[PDB]
Amino acid sequence: NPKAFPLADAALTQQILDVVQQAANLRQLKKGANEATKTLNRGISEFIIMAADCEPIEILLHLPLLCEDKNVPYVFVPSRVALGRACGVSRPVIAASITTNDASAIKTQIYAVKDKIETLL
Amino acid sequence: MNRKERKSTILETLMGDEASNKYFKRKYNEIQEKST
Amino acid sequence: TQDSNYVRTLRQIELKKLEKGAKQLMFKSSGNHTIFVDSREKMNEFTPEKFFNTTSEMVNRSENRLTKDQLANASSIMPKESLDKKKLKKFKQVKQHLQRETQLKQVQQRMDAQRELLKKGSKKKIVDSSGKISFKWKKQRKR
Amino acid sequence: AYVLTETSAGYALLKASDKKIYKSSSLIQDLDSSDKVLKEFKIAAFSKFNSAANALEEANSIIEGKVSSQLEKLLEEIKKDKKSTLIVSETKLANAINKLGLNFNVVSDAVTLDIYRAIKEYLPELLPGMSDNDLSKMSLGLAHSIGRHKLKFSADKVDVMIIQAIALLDDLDKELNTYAMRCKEWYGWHFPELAKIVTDSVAYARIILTMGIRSKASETDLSEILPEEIEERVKTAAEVSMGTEITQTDLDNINALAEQIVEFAAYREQLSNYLSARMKAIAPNLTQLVGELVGARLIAHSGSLISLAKSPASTIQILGAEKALFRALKTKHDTPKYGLLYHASLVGQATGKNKGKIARVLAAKAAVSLRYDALAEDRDDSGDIGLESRAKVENRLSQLEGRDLRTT
Amino acid sequence: KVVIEPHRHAGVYIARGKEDLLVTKNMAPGESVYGEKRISVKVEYRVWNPFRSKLAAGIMGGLDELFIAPGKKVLYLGAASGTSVSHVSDVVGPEGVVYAVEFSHRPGRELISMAKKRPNIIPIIEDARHPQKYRMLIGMVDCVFADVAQPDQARIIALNSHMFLKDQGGVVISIKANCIDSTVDAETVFAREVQKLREERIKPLEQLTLEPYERDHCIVVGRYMRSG
Amino acid sequence: KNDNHIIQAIALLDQLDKDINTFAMRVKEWYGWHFPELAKLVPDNYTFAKLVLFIKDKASLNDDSLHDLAALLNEDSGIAQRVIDNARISMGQDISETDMENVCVFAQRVASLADYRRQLYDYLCEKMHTVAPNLSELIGEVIGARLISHAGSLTNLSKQAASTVQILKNKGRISRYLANKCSMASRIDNY
RNA sequence: GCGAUGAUCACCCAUGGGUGGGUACAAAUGGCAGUCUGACAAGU
DSSP states (O other): OOSSOSBOOHHHHHHHHHHHHHHHHHTOEEESHHHHHHHHHHTOEEEEEEESSOSSSHHHHTHHHHHHHTTOOEEEESOHHHHHHHHTBSSOOSEEEEEOOSSOTTHHHHHHHHHHHHHHO | OOSSSOOSSHHHHHHHOSHHHHHHHHHHHHHHHHHO | OOOHHHHHHHHHHHHHHHHHHHHHSOOOOOOOOEEOOSSHHHHHTOOHHHHHTOOHHHHHSSSOOOOHHHHOOTTSSSIIIIIHHHHHHHHHHHHHHHHHHHHHHHHHHHHHHHHHHHHOSOEEEEEETTTEEEEEEOSOOBO | OEEEEEOSSEEEEEEOOSOHHHHHHHHHHTTOOSHHHHHHSOOSEEEEOOSOHHHHHHHHHHHHHSOOHHHHHHTTSSOSSSOOOEEOSOHHHHHHHHHSSSOOOEEOSSSTHHHHHHHHHSHHHHTTTTOOSOTHHHHHHHHHHHHHHHTTOOTTOOHHHHHHHHHHHHHHHHHHHHHHHHHHHHHTTTOHHHHHHOOOHHHHHHHHHHOOSHHHHHHSOOTTTSOHHHHHHHHHHHHSOOOOOOOHHHHHHHHHHHHHHHHHHHHHHHHHHHHHHHHHHHOHHHHHHTOHHHHHHHHHHHSSHHHHHHSOHHHHHTSSOHHHHHHHHHTTOOOOSOTTGGGSHHHHHSOTHHHHHHHHHHHHHHHHHHHHHHHOSSOOOSOHHHHHHHHHHHHHHHHHHHSOOSOO | OOEEEEOSSTTEEEEESSSOEEEEEOSSTTOOSSSOOEEEOOOEEEEOOTTTOHHHHHHHHOOSOOOOOTTOEEEEEOOSTTTTHHHHHHHHOTTSEEEEEOOSHHHHHHHHHHHHHOSSEEEEOSOTTOTTTSTTTOOOEEEEEEOOOOSOHHHHHHHHHHHHEEEEEEEEEEEOHHHHTSSSOHHHHHHHHHHHHHHTTEEEEEEEEOTTTSSSOEEEEEEEOSOO | OOOHHHHHHHHHHHHHHHHHHHHHHHHHHHHHHHOHHHHHHOOOHHHHHHHHHHOSSTTOOOHHHHHHHHHSSOSTTSHHHHHHHHHHSOOOOOOOHHHHHHHHHHHHHHHHHHHHHHHHHHHHHHHHHHHOHHHHHHTOHHHHHHHHHHHSSHHHHHHSOHHHHHTOOHHHHHHHHHHHHHHHHHHHHHO
């Protein structure tokens, strides 16, 4: 898929899914395509993780428009099943959004991974 | 009546009227001074 | 008293109104303008008045650094006192919008935290030595 | 030597000194972008391509990639001797015209940006040569056509046309209704019990077209307009009516008005069918899912289809009833749960709490199908995603309906 | 109630009323091509926003020579949905012309809509790296402005300027070091790109850092000299 | 002495003119999507609908086509050669044959509506000479029918006084004079 | 060579224009004006 342009390599996926898992435990994370779109419209999203093997790809390809329109970093990971396991819900999630909070224990990791994604863009 | 005075609410056109406005502020200042 | 829906509505109202105000407003520039001069003697004899062929007010202002050949506010009532007052009124209106918006954000965040702590999990109430209360969900995949 | 140049109006060829590289050096080193050098070198052979915009577009695409038959019938007699050299700017074009049949020698994108840039500079002086015009509009229309083809714009996928069509449909319905009111109260001077007993504007105007006066209606049959009980009802009304008698001139003009009425209604039906075809051509999966009319209404609310795609699902659920939404949010009541999807067939098929739940599920699947229809770069236009999503909503509806409430 | 003061650049004006604004004229009356608010005083007018147009940030910052006069032809690299090239069309007016160039598809269709409205903008949906590929439609443009955010910016600008620009012409580039280098000092990046342009025969005159309107952005203005 | 024909004819006339203008603007929009330069070449909307009905699609441009769209009204304003050039070099986005069919059916619809408006206005003038000939001769057929519709009936118009007819320096003199003579005309034409 | 079939009855610059107001229609990507919740539910 060339439409999934920024696709993470292995180590980048590992870092991203670890940050997603910590953000889910702290509950700084919003799961699902519609909930991620709502966070983006609210302007409270830190950054966007999407799946790549979603069936099909357009139903979340609607997101990069809003993503760089409000200038939010976004990334694609290969497996929506991996994304669901990392989010910590029993169903495969195709798009998750780390929100913004600075009274948060994982601010440093969030900023590191967001910087690395932005460099990949 | 007019078109630029036709307002969608009877309270809106009442406070849009002006002689009522000066009468209302006059009598309200009177009764407020009487209250205090 | 009120609800998260009402606070969310008011926050989006004020955010869009502040955006329209910032679109209508005007910000004066502050940049590091450089001029690239060929020879060192011209560098030594450079002066902005001659380089831009303006006057002193026209060179210390940056918007209209008009040509002197181009040169070759008293229409409204109370120019020195009312117009600047109205412009400062617009600026303070945008500022009041911004502070009311962030106060609504704080109220919304506290209401959201209360709603989640009411909502769900296996939580332990942890206190931090700055006195601050958090709730720790145990790691458990919610089904 | 020869040099080729591509213009928006034709292909031109110019002859110059055979030492063309040294000629270009002389050009730049004597600053020969002027009319002196251009009258030294005006032209050799012009070929204006025809006044056929599709031929312009395909000719330009072949100029980008390959060599055309127009280039051939220009290149039939470039030469006099078996070997002549030609300047060209595209390297792929250079090796192409090397590989072609005349086998005359060509030079690729050499130092001859001198030549190309100077002849584009004083190509205004070449305008009295063969093309006595201003090619700004030529380049404009050509660039618009090339951009259309590069974006691969299918002529049937036009959301501005679908929003124009739905707005015109609503305007037609309104103006047909007021003309029906006018015709009804004009003919009410002659047959008011009919004006009450029938309510179809079209049946009204067809009756006005068949009969004109009451006993003429009594002798004329009215099977194809109305059923038997209603036509004998208007028979009795024609027996005992109360209106005046109409002169033949007024009958003529009210008849012309009735013709305008029925032609308006027939055109409105035809336009609704055209709108259906446009929805099935533009966003087929959403037509398969929610239904054509509600799909067009959602798109018209959102403005453009891509704005509708960027909207999330809950906005699509409550896309119509925004007044109820914002008022209920402010005064702390319950939000609307139907909006504009309520007139879809599946929401009309469900009931109550099943109506609310089916509206939610169908709004989510509608957002899915809609995003796919908007963002599918290539698309089979079949209806596959919409059909399988509709199957999912149908299974959910059957399950929700089968689940009862009272303990049996 | 709104005074119009002509700016030192021919084509741009300033609205002095309740709230001061940087304005241009209109060529499509009564149609804001992206949602900006329009004024009239009568003659229609339309405001530039510095936070959306790097050209607006440059003019609002103050510039010596902007080579886009009304009677000119200007080439635009990277018209992202045209939100600045509409304003440049209105600055030029019907006497000149502007060739917008875009590659990515969805702002491509946006630019097609805007260029179907305006007759001064002509759109080129061709990728900007191949002037041999789009060399037919454009002839000897007068000024060139660049918004492209690709790291081979100096090379693609030198290519387009060699193949299209009139000699002794004007070259204006917007450049972001958070795109080009993003780990070292922006002033060092600006010295480096200036050296690149001097290598590619553009003689630079000025640069301006658009500091209150954007973060880490410069705009360079230079002449194209001694070339064919 | 029935006058509701006059009243209905006036209501139909003003609604008909408004709808003619609306549908002509709609034809302008759609054939401007196809070819906008014709919409800026001929601002006359009725002739624009006719010219769309002739040049459905912008490809057919011959010299016999030139002569036929010259017979479409005229040549003296260069419109024929100008539209040949502008449809040869137009920026027009092409549309489908179904949309072209809907466009030309719409233009035929507009032409039939304009024909009906002309016929209705002539019928109104005839009925005004029939019913209220003195008032029609005094002020005018259309204006007299406007007065009758403003009043409500010829009975209402003749029943009212003269100042009310007026509300229904020498400019004011002539206005009051004409109002009084209009009132007397309405009296004799009703009774 | 009259008349009840109706007599009489806001600003500036010198009978010219500028400012304000009323009426009908039309356009607005003009304003009011902000797009709900977000993980469990049903049978055993």
